[PDB]
């Protein structure tokens, strides 16, 4: 039950010359047949291939000071940003990795950064050693990401990154980690490496590698950053990762005693090729493509070609000629990153099912025996013949100038076992949310512009995939935005709206907060005929509604009563929609730090908090609302825009609620009200459709009777902190007896007071759990008084009791920082390749 388990490549990232800043841009360069040879930049201080942004670093993203960033070797910084991008390609939000066996293996050597004396002004003392010692290149990644498997920096020159891959594959097979980042980085800071190869006469004047060409006259120095994410195939499939290829086998060895430390030996190259085949249990006939070391040196190219001839050339059998190429023909010699660059080239190929081409410049080298016809240069895009197995495979080679050699077999990934897919809460409406996050607003804007450009340049991409990917395969940062969209084109328009600062429907913006969420249960006038009907397909919701039907009939003979009103029906139905909407938020991941209610709302809130069972909570609102129909006739209520005290004629009307700084309820005698009302026809007052006045003495008649009816209820300790609008503070759920429920009907509702307290205590998000926003505007006004940044949210709305509205609410709750379990909401779609985090890099170059 143990063997060389296949290792899977689940992500990849690279920064390479020729303006390549992602695997996909590398594909463009290779199919274009453009190269990157250009003159050395002046901004370094002393022809070749150079990275666009070698010295740019989003230092603030990773919490690194600008002084330390200036001291960090540009290789340390590329490795750190490219590691991040690789995990994003694997679809792993890097936070989930903190405390993980994840290992880091970085191939690298020294390139002459920070060799002068430190200009004291720059103030890099205390940072320069750590910014430039090899082990830190790998240790820093594990520090910044909280990774806890092995972290090593390895130097074998040109093969460094393939040796790092080889080591990570053993680490994974051995149990030393369960996920690994492996790759290499180089940035030619100083001119020492270029100078030594010039002196040797090893560099083409072009700056271009002409691999296997008659025009080969030396290699072109390059640089870059190339990283893959490795995982044992079993763990990959079990976690449903998107496998890009697999390392079927790999090998490492040494030239030994060649003719000069740098001299190449074809025999060594053959043996390393053959150990790889052995580890992978294949023969050369099973490999259609070879991505060679391929540096364009007159004497080395034939050495490499003779060993391919002696290995891949023989017994090709059924398999036609082997295709041969080298990515150095487009980007130059990327030194410590050369190997994995090659590996990312063949992986791009596997995606598209074709053999990646090479910039063939001129005629084949006359020094190579092509007479067998068994090796062909990959001149343009070609068919990738599977092997007799039906498996496509490639071979990648890196032969370092210190004599250590590597060869790796990359194979297409096996077919995944199909698994039963999880269900998506909320019926499908074609509308999908697409969420964005960055560490600043400029970065947030840039993310949105890039997603829009990608989706415009890549249409046909399934919006469900962009939705799932940006919610499940990306980390959520401080500054957020979300865009509802029914089809790709509507996404681009609204993503551009985020990008350019436009307010537009279907687009929301917000900052994520530490503080808790408070569920506001209003009651009052949240009802509308036909409410929340479109949510009865949702089992979480429908089930709550059904159990509510059971216990209502037993206590009031009533039920759904919305297949197609009056106070002792409306209140038992608004109770039911509110505890149901609450359970729906719960099952979508919004967990309440506290519950608060307005009058009857407090009964749904006590249920939602666990202080009263669903049964007792129904009985309390059924026999509280039957008891109010018994003091009908005389009595009514009115809303009065304008704050209390100013509204505070006596003995017939009194203040019965306070809802915000600019909103009060007054109640008392029916006629007496019309009096106040038509008085104000000359304040924006308005009367509530009521035949009685609660929170007044008109209710003392039903006291004792109510208290009795609800004497069998059993208040329990709450699971969620219940804030009493009566007491004005937190209250053990045992204290919610009939007395409390009478005193709730009689005493005045100090709701503005409670919202002020909860704002004082630092709660961040108020979610009105109701079929129509009733208190939301009043709460929003209270927060403006306290000059607060707390956010207020509705759930459903009249003409909006649909899933599309709850989806909108989920989108806004998440944008404010409420934890939406997007897995439970958008089930589990596939991972699509979308732009990475939009690093806001500044230049640092000592």
């Amino acid at each position, epitope marked *: 039950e143990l063997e060389s388990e296949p290792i899977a490549i689940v992500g990849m990232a690279c920064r390479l010359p020729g303006e390549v800043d992602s695997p996909e841009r590398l594909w463009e360069l290779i199919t274009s047949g453009r190269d990157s040879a250009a003159e050395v930049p002046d901004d370094r201080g002393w022809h070749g291939n150079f990275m666009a942004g070698a010295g740019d670093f989003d230092a603030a993203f990773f919490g690194i000071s600008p002084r330390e960033a200036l001291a960090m070797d540009p290789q340390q910084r590329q490795a750190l940003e490219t590691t991040w991008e690789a995990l994003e390609s694997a679809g792993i939000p890097p936070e989930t990795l903190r405390g993980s066996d994840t290992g880091v293996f970085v191939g690298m050597s020294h390139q002459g950064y920070a060799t002068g004396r430190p200009r004291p002004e720059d103030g890099v003392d205390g940072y320069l050693l750590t910014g430039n010692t090899a082990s830190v290149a790998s240790g820093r990644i594990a520090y910044v990401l909280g990774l806890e498997g092995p972290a090593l920096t390895v130097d074998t020159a040109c093969s460094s990154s393939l040796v790092a891959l080889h080591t990570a594959c053993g680490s994974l097979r051995d149990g030393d980690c369960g996920l690994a980042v492996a790759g290499g980085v180089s940035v030619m800071a100083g001119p020492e490496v270029f100078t030594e190869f010039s002196r040797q006469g090893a560099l083409s004047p072009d700056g271009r590698c002409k691999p296997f060409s008659d025009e080969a006259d030396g290699f072109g120095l390059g640089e870059g950053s190339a990283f893959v994410v490795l995982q044992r195939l079993s763990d990959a499939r079990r976690e449903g990762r998107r496998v890009l290829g697999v390392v079927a086998g790999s090998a490492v060895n040494q030239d030994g005693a060649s003719n000069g430390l740098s001299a190449p030996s074809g025999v060594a190259q053959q043996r390393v090729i053959r150990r790889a085949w052995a580890r992978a249990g294949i023969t050369g006939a099973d490999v259609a493509v070879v991505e060679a070391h391929g540096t364009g040196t007159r004497l080395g190219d034939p050495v490499e070609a003779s060993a391919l001839l002696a290995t891949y050339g023989k017994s090709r059998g059924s398999s036609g000629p082997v295709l041969l190429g080298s990515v150095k023909s487009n980007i130059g010699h990327a030194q410590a990153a050369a190997g994995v660059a090659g590996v990312i080239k063949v992986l791009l190929g596997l995606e598209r099912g074709v053999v990646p081409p090479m910039l063939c410049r001129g005629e084949r080298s006359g020094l190579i025996d092509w007479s067998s016809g068994e090796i062909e240069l990959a001149d343009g895009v070609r068919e990738w013949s599977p092997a007799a197995d039906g498996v496509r495979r490639a071979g990648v080679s890196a032969f370092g100038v210190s004599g250590t050699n590597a060869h790796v077999i990359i194979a297409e990934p096996p077919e995944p076992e199909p698994v039963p897919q999880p269900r998506r809460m909320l019926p499908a409406t074609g509308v999908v949310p697409v969420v964005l996050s960055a560490r600043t607003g400029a970065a947030l804007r840039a993310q949105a512009g890039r997603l829009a450009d990608h989706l415009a340049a890549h249409p046909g991409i399934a919006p469900a995939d962009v939705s799932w990917t940006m919610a499940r395969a990306r980390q959520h940062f401080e500054e957020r935005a979300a865009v509802l969209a029914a089809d790709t084109a509507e996404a681009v328009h609204r993503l551009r709206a985020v990008a350019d600062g436009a307010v537009v429907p279907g687009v929301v913006t917000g900052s994520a907060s530490d503080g808790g969420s408070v569920f506001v249960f209003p009651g009052q006038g949240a009802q509308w005929e036909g409410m929340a009907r479109e949510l009865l397909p949702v089992p979480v919701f429908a089930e709550s509604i059904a159990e509510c039907d059971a216990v209502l009939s037993e206590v009031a003979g009533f039920s759904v009563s919305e297949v197609l009103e009056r106070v002792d029906v409306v209140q038992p139905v608004l109770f039911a929609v509110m505890v149901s909407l609450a359970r729906l938020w719960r099952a979508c991941g919004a967990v309440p730090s506290a519950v608060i209610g307005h009058s009857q709302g407090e009964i749904a809130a006590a249920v939602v908090a666990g202080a009263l069972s669903l049964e007792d909570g129904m009985r309390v609102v059924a026999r509280r609302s039957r008891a109010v129909r018994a003091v009908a006739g005389r009595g009514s209520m009115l809303s009065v825009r304008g704050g209390r005290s100013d509204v505070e004629w006596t003995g017939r009307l009194e203040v019965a609620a306070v809802n915000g700084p600019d909103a009060v309820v007054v109640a008392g005698d029916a006629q007496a009200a019309r009096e106040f009302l038509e008085y104000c026809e000359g304040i924006r007052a308005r009367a509530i459709p009521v035949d009685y006045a609660s929170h007044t003495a008109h209710v003392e008649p039903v006291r004792d009777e109510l208290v009795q009816a609800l004497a069998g209820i059993t208040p329990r300790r709450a699971e969620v902190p219940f804030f009493s609008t009566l007491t004005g503070d937190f209250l053990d759920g045992t204290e919610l007896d009939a007395g409390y429920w009478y005193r709730n009907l009689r005493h005045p509702v100090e709701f503005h007071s409670a919202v002020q307290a909860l704002t004082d205590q630092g709660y961040a998000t108020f979610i009105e759990v109701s079929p129509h926003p009733v208190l939301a505007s009043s709460v929003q006004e209270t927060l403006d008084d306290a000059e607060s940044d707390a956010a207020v949210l509705g759930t459903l709305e009249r003409d909006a009791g649909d899933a599309d509205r709850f989806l909108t609410a989920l989108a806004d709750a998440h944008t404010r920082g409420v934890a939406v379990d997007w897995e*439970a909401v958008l089930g589990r779609a596939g991972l699509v390749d979308l732009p990475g985090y939009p690093f806001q890099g500044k230049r640092f170059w000592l």
Partner: antibody
Amino acid sequence: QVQLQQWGAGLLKPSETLSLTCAVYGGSFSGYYWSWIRQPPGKGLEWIGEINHSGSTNYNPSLKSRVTISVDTSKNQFSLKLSSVTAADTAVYYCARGRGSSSSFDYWGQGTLVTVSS
Amino acid sequence: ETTLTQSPGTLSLSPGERATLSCRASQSVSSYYLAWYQQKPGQAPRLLMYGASNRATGIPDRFSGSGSGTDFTLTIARLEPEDFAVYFCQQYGTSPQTFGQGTNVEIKR
């Protein structure tokens, strides 16, 4: 209250077509997901399909090719048709109320034994 | 399809004892989409638990449901006579809604 009654031909010959119907009494046919669930003898139950008062259906892929369920909203009734029957289909067929698409079932029919023999 | 394997085959006990009925899924399922049923013989199933742990209206409080991803459990505090029956779990989170093969709960003598 709520109560379910189903009727239909119990005995069938192979290659024929099972046809049962269920009647809902007192319930709100609107908003619930009326469902067929069979149970081969002494075995675990197996979900066939469902339909709401609108006509939206959902069938188990294991039988979709030969199953059809339907509603009559003015009769308050819903029904199962199962083609090309076989002795595999010998089961106790039950109609039931689903609290949401493909959900839990609270109210259940009395069960119709359906025996496919020759 | 997701598979539900119930355990044990047939738990025997006597009235009063505590019966613990278990159910293992072939893959993880949200707790919101698991259910428990009782089936007295020659009758229909009767819903006991929905959403893993929520007791259906009218079900005595001695029936307790619990469990998470893959492993869920139904527990009766005190076996009363009318409880001796067969019990079925049901997952309804994977597209194909599926049911346990069943566990008998017989009289021990």
